[PDB]
Each structure stands twice: as C-alpha cells, then as structure tokens.
Amino acid sequence: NNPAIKRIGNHITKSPEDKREYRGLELANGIKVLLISDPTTDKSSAALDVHIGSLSDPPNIAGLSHFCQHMLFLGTKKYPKENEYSQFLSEHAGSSNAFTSGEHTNYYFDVSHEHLEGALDRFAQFFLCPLFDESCKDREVNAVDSEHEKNVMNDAWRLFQLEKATGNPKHPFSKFGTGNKYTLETRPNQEGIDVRQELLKFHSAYYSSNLMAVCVLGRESLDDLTNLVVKLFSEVENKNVPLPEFPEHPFQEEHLKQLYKIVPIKDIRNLYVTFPIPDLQKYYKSNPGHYLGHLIGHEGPGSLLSELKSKGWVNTLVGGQKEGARGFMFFIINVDLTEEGLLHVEDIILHMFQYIQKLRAEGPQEWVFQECKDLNAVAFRFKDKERPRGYTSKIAGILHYYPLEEVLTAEYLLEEFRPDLIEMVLDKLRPENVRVAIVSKSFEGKTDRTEEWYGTQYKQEAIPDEVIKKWQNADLNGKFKLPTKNEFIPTNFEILPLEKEATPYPALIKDTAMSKLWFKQDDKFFLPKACLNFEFFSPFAYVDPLHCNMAYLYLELLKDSLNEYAYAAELAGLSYDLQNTIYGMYLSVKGYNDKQPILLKKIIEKMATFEIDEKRFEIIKEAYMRSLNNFRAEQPHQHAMYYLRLLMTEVAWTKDELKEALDDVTLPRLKAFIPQLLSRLHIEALLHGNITKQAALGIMQMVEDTLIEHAHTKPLLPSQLVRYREVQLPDRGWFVYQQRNEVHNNCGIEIYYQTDMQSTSENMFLELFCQIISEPCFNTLRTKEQLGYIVFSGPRRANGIQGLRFIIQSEKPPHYLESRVEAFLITMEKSIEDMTEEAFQKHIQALAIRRLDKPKKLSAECAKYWGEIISQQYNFDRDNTEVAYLKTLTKEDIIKFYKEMLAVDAPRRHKVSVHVLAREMDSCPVVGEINLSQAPALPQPEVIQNMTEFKRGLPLFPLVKPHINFMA
C-alpha cells in the first residue's frame, strides 16, 4: 500500500533483555530507517548519516565536506534563523553534534521526548533546503580553521595525515579532510571560486536520499514514528549517486618495505608496523581480521607483549585490523618503546614475525573462535541500555553496512568459522608487505622531509633487503604460545530476587572506624552485573610531592604486574580501575558479578604483598618523567584549567614540583613507602548491582581482612580524614595569573566568577543562569564573533564551592577575550530582562528535564551515588529536592543573583582569570581598551606572582556539611 515506503523489514533481532520496540524499513527514495519506541525515555533522539565524506572532497577545495557539515546548522529556507536549531534544542533540554569522516557525515541530536517532531522537523531541513548564507560562510570558516589549529601540534593528527601523505598521492586517501581558512577561503578566492556555490553543488550532488540512513527514538509507537519519518524525510530527492569505492589500496609496491623516522611533539617513543590488507567488512559474520587481532594483540601468558616486555623493550601493544575505506584496510601492530627498545626495533619486529609464524604453524583454532563468539553473545544479551543520542548516531552509521534485521546483532553475533579467511589475511602479514614507522625525538635534526599540512619532520628510507630476508626467515620462538581457555568467562547470570529491605538509594550498612559501606541492590536494570567502588584514605599519598610520586609509581607498578593475569578478566567483561588520589587510592571493579570477588581478592592481596621488579621500576619511572614533561605539549585551554585548579585548591603540587622530587624516589625508598601507606587506613565503599546485602558486607570484610592480614592495616583517626578547601576570593576583587604555552600558537583563557558555597538555593541560581546563557554564549562568542573553535561556559564545582566559568581557546590575546566575555555578560542581563515570563519558565523546565533524566545503565546510576559519596554531601535525593526548588525561582531572583554576584559593579564579584599566551608571544597586558556589543570598562587587576603567596594572603572557605543518612 503505502507508496512512500519501499519495504518494511522483518522482525529486528534484539536482546531478550531489551524492552524497546524496533521497526526497520526503507523509504521509496531509498533512505534506510530504524525506528525505536521507548515509552519510558525522557529524551528522544534522531540521527542521519550520509554515506559520503571528505574522501569525496574536490581536489581543489580540501575540507569542503566538513565545511558543509558546519554550515547546515546555520539556517534553512524553512527555518532561516542562524541558530533556530540550537536555540530550539537548548530551550527543550536537547543537544546536538556532528562529525565528518572519510566516508561519512553523521548528524545527531536529542531533546525532551515531547518535542521530537519540532526538533526532527528543523533537523530534516538540513538535508532539504540549507541556506549556506554568505555572512555565515565568511564567519564559520574560522571555526573550521580553529579546529585544525588545535590539531596541528597533536601527535595523533600529525601521524594520521602522514600515513595519508606517505601512500600514493594520486589516491584520494592522501586528501586533507579537516580543511582550514587557507583551503576554504584564501585559496578558493585566488581562483575565483564562490564557495557558496560549491557548497550548494556539493550538497545538491552528494546529499542524495539513496546514500542516507536515519534512526529515530522516542516514546511514540512504531506506527506514529513511521508516519513521522515518512512525512519529514520522504521528500528528500533521490539522485541515484553511486557509492564511492576505492578497490585499489593506497599502499602499492613502491610504498611497501619502507621505513619512516618521525619527530614527535611530545617526548614519546613509538613503533608502528602496518600491512595493507583487503577490505574485510563483508566478512562480519566471521571477522577473520579480529581473530588475528585477538591473538597477536593478546596479552596474558605466552603472548607477544609478554616477551617484548620481559626483554624490557616494550610496555604496551595494540594489534588488529584498522579501517581504511570501502575497498581497503590495514593490519597494524603498534608498540611503545623503552630506551633499550628504541635500539632494538629490528629485533622487536623479528619477534612479531616469529609469533605470526607460530600462528601459521598452529593453524586456525576453532575453540578460540567459539570462545570469542560465546563472549560476544553474552555481551549482546546483557548489553547496557545506551543513551539515545549516541545510540541513534551509531545505528544511522551502521545501517549502511548491514541488513535492517541484523543492524543490532551484526557487530556482536558471530556465525561462521572461516579458517580460509584467517589464513588469507595471515598470508598478507609478511616482511615484503610491511611498512615501519618509528617516532622518537632522537630523529630531531636527522630528518630531510616535511609533511605540508602539519609540518611534520621525517625521513624515509627503504628497508635493506637483508633485513627483510632475516624477518622472512623467522623460526618458532619457544617463548611464544597460544592463549589457554579463559577461566574468567562468566557462567552464573542469575538475577537475585529483590530483597525485602531493598531501598531506593544506597544505604549505610556498615559504619566502623576502619570502613563505611554504602550499599544498594539493583532495582531497575536487572542485568548480571555489579559496581564495587572503594575509596582508600591515607595522608601519605599526598603529604608531599615525593609521596604523591610514589603513590603513583606504586599503583602503576602494581597494574603492570597484574596485567597479564587481569587481561583475561578484561576480555570476559570484568575490569577494574586503580589510581592514586589526593586523598589516597581509588579502586573500582565493574562488569559481570559472577567472578568479581576473585579479581578483587587478587588485587588487594597483590596490593598488600607487592614485590617490585627493579627493571620494571626504572622503565616506568622514566616514562612517568616524560609524562610529566609532556604536559608542556597540552592545549592552552588545558593549561588554563590546570592553573586555576592549582590556584583555587588549598593543597596542590605542581607538575614541576613532582618531576623535581621524581629523582629522589629510589627502589629502596618506594619499598618502604608501600607498607607505610597501607599501615593506617579508612575505606568508604559503594557496592551497587546484582548483589545481596550479605554478599556486600562479605566483600567489604574480605578486603579489610586481606589488608589486616598482609599489611597489619589499622583504622585511621576520624580527624585524619581531611578534605581540602577552596581559596575564598574577596568582594569586588579581581586577580589575574599569566603563563605561556611554548608549543601551541594559540592563546587560552579561563575566567572564574566565584559565587558561594554549594547549597540547594545557591546551586539552582547558578544552574538556571547557566541554562539561560548556554546557547547564547556559544552563538555569540563563536558563531557570530568567532573567537575560537573552543568556546565553553558553565558551572564550576570544587571543594564544596561553586561559580560560573568561561573557557576559550583563541588566536586573539586573553585581555581581548576577556573584554568580549564582559560584553556578553551585559548582553545577557538585558536579555533576561527582556525575556517573557514563559520563556523564563521554559528554561526552568528545560533545566528540570536535564536534571531528572534517568540513568539508563547500572554504572551511570552508580556514578551519581558515587558523586554524593566522594563530595561527602550524600544528597541521594538531590535531583527531586533541587528541581522542586528551581520551579520556585522567578526572573527577579535571577536578575538579583546576577546584580549581586556577577555584574561588573556587583558588590560581591569574585573574579579570577588565567591567561595562557601563545608560543610566539613574549608579553601581553592583563587588561586593555563594529557590529559588536560594547564591552564595559574593567578595573585594574591584581597580578598573581607566586601561587603560594596568593593563597596565604586569602582566607579559606569552610567545607560543606553532609546531608543526613541514618542506619547502623
């Protein structure tokens, strides 16, 4: 019947745990659609994926696709307003983003479930009638240039483009996808090109319905969603565009057996080994490429990483297939190098080929296939319920590769065992088809080439035929053995019956001097999983720079020691996180509950009886040193955030103090440290998931007893449970701290307007105001003024204190950036005074939905509780309490709030600014003097010379009082 629909797919295979309804289909114009009905979702979502990307960029206008992506948000014939789309989402608790890859342009958004249509309608016009306004084009081109600017000094982007440049230049794979002002404005202007028209042509030529896939999720029934989509998208024209293909691999003969030496920005040592392979996408039912990735990248006993690590040459390894594009792929084996490893690259590669030989000798193993297959089935069946926005985005993308009925299982369920495909791929992993790249500062001054788009310095040499021969003649190494059955594979998935004393929030079931235990049996997700979070309190983890370094090294050495054993647990869906904090240690164990007690016991036992391998100590210590120094290569805005942190926190060691004390840590010193650190402790945990109260108390007591038995751990005094405070800025004061980033040629800035201590009223005043200025800030500071790609605003919360913050990374100097933000602040005051009571009440409603949005999965809900515990506020019913209060606020309250704490002449303005200057900028003032709003005059700021003196001269805020929670 329905002429608008070409076909309605059959039942969409889903997990029996998934309560959501699905319906796949294809419109007459060829758009592949997947509809999802979730009557409980608080936010609805939609996404569209055009199977065309930067690889299709015209040779003379690199980045056009990406620019097209940006421009579609800037207005359509149906909705002309520059930010009609953004403003609509923001006002209805929604959000949106989009990305461009070589073959895809993915657009997505989410919004309050009762406004899907309004949002979808505006969204559909992007693919129907974009305006590509001339004024918007001249401006938006800066955001793109700004985006590329931040990547220029990023080692990942540099290496990503270098591989493209080192392949065949004729192949479209060598194209520069990001684009910048030069390629999108300057250059095209020197060639009489009207970018407006090119955008119109590109959109008209490639944005064809036959190359699109859409996924929508909402509370509406499947029929309602169907009529909705048919009504908004069936009008997209089908121009029958052939799907681009690239059967000829970018790496041909002349590109093989090549060695590349690259100079990195950060001080890192890496070895990259690549093999050109066919496109294995079509073989998703067997995944031969992953089979080899599973083995070659395996950690655990007998693996390649094991030998490479025991020889002290490598620390980490990554192997497997890497995506290329329709027609080609690569198989990689990358590894970080130690100092010794750098001098043994040839030997490392030999081991790689020896292990590969072992695989050819043993032949394809079906039990290995069955194992991964069983794990993937368990993973799919008990997959966590995803958030709409990311879910619609993913589906829209994969609808292009799999049948409607299999779009959910395609990436999980394995069906075919293909020893013939496995051998076929293995036959490509040979010395004569290899590419090797080494990244090291040791190449500095020895290179003779430069990548044009990023300026990467490197050298290219052919691999000497004898080195190739030696690799080709690799024999079996007895140290290399296939993995054995994975004993961590779960088998018990029974969901315990919801106990009688089951509470809505975590309950305190143990309150002793040694430990405080918060517990909650899962009452809504019903999956065989659990979250076990432990907070270990010890003053010796952050007493001084030296101990902080040891706290770090200790845990880093420990994780390096359990790795081999822990890897199996990882593959079996059981992982953990262990790291040092300013208060001691943090341990988290999550995944299937079945075998968690086994991994946990093992970690704590190893923790309290650890024995440091000297060789491992020197290697990891050297890396840590580089890690600290490498902070100099981080982005300007990251530096700004870092400085503000050091400035506002009572106690904080800088990275300079850390590396300085790093030469004082010796093996003897570290060995003494550990027992000291564990001697006296206090543990606060949160056990949440498929577990009983008795299992929880049991797990908590097992941890303590293990520590008590091996480390003689004793309880910590209550007064020893210190919490750091935040510096209390003086009324009407303004301080400025200035620094310089010596790597990036961009400026960074962060402005913090401290308000007051956290509390129900103070929190919502700050949050309502942020909700109201959020979209206007982005639209004003970026879209119109184009200060930079990174323009952020929102609340800052720390040590129980809070306030409004602004973060911007730009080419413009900080003193100018500040002037603009001050100008924006005044624009908002007028804006709030001019908005209707309904518009105001609308933002309240939008903030309410954002705050009440339910977690979809166990770990998400656990995170919320963990936050209440970590901050020691324990306000588990915060969302309902705070929203109720918010619904009470008036426009007058917000106006008074701003006038009292935010305005330039505010009686209680507490302002601190962090100015990060660009590389090529010696000095720069701290203050200074079109169609831009007028910036108010600013007072003379006090320049912070020394951080320590700054804090000493200021008072400290008190800590927030805990919310009441009773139980024995």
């Binding site: 990406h66 992506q69 940006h70 948000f73 949106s96 983003n97 989009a98 990305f99 461009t100 890859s101 895809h104 793109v144 985006e147 990942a156 982007w157 990503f160 996808g177 990001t178 992953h290 990735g293 599973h294 990248g297 395996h298 950690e299 390894l317 990554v318 192997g319 497997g320 297939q321 890497k322 995506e323 990689i332 890897y567 982005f778 790609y789 990174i790 952020f792 929102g794």
Partner: peptide, 18 residues
C-alpha cells in the same frame, strides 16, 4: 590488545563538554 577495543579521528562540530 585488539584494535577492535581501542579513537578513529573525525572532525566534530562541537568540542566535548566532558
């Protein structure tokens, strides 16, 4: 580890709020 478990690099409209 398996690459399958890894940061493909694409260009996003907006930076991450996280």
């Amino acid at each position: 580890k398996c690459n399958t478990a890894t940061q493909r690099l694409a260009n996003f409209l907006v930076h991450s709020s996280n």
